[PDB]
Amino acid sequence: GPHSMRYYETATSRRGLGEPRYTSVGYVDDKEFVRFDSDAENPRYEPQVPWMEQEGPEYWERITQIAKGQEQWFRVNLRTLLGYYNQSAGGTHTLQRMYGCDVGSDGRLLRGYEQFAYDGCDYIALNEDLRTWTAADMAAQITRRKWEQAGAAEYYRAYLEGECVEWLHRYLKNG
Amino acid sequence: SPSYAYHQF
């Protein structure tokens, strides 16, 4: 019938000295199937389920490089939100991201998600039309104007309508 | 496969 794929990401800046920690966990049909942790010995995506082992080294290498880039993005944009909310550095703060797709019984997309929360509070979320944004406060409206100029919604919609669905069907064939 | 956030706050 219907199936779903979801990623939850967290980035928390550390105590005074170190750099933040970034975790990424993916779910297929509400089962955790991959995980990445920047505090690990050597950070890399790892299989959380035996039927993800049938992927070659190129797969884990590539998504791991994506994760490296995402870590950098989280450092940069936590600094930006420090700026927007006028908070002192050297504190502790959290950025949380959730995105993914719900596809139905016909195999195509019923709903896409892309949304961001800061320190436990909603920051900006992609509406169900996948073309407009809900911004919870003023700083979020700054970001929203930027993302309207930059065509962010089209970028995310390209992911959610295309590779999200196809990668999910792919992971389901792995079962 | 993950999606890079890309766009800046």
Epitope: Q65, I66, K68, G69, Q72, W73, R75, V76, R79, T80, A150, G151, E154, Y155, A158, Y159, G162, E163 | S3, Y4, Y6, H7, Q8
Partner: T-cell receptor, first 110, second 108 residues
Framework: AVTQSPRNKVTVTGGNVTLSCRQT?????MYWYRQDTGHGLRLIHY???????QIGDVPDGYKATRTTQEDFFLLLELASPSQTSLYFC??????????FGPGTRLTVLE | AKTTQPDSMESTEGETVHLPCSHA???????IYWYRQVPLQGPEYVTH???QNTTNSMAFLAIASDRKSSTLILTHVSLRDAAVYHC??????????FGKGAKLTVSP
Amino acid sequence: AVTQSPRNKVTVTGGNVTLSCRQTNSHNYMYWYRQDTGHGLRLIHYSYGAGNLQIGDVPDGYKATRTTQEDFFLLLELASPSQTSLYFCASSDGDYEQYFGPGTRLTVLE
Amino acid sequence: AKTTQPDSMESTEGETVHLPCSHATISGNEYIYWYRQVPLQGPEYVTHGLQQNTTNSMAFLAIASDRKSSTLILTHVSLRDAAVYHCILQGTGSKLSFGKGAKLTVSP
């Protein structure tokens, strides 16, 4: 705006050379490139914010310092003839479009 | 992820110039960006795109349906359009050299 200083520089090999870049775009990323015929535009060092430094593609013989969000410096503590080149700094908001400075032409003579 | 262009191209003023770019390993996390560098200057942004063709006052950008190739289209080039045009991928935080690009000459 991205400004560079000096615009031209001639020095003997083994000397100390500092290139200065300033950026009033409120951008986080800044970059130092060199321009040479036959190679195009190659990246030396970059930075995503004050205090951050990341190695580029051709970093040997260069250090860099990001003292503030506006200021980025390229240091050649032991300048050598192969570092004769045309140097461009640039700024960027994340992975959006880069804005380049006017260029510094450097000749290093033996 | 890297791009490939023919390093030079000759043209005559009044022609419409098609600058090709090959990027077969592109991913969904990367945009196609095009820059222009006139002699004695640093590059400047020309255009960029994700999937759909893109148009502005400086150029038209045609993206292959599979995104594995690109074409920067300059309408009725004049002498001031002679420059090095850089086609690069941006995204994933990867900060790389621009490379050599394509040297466009415009003859009268």
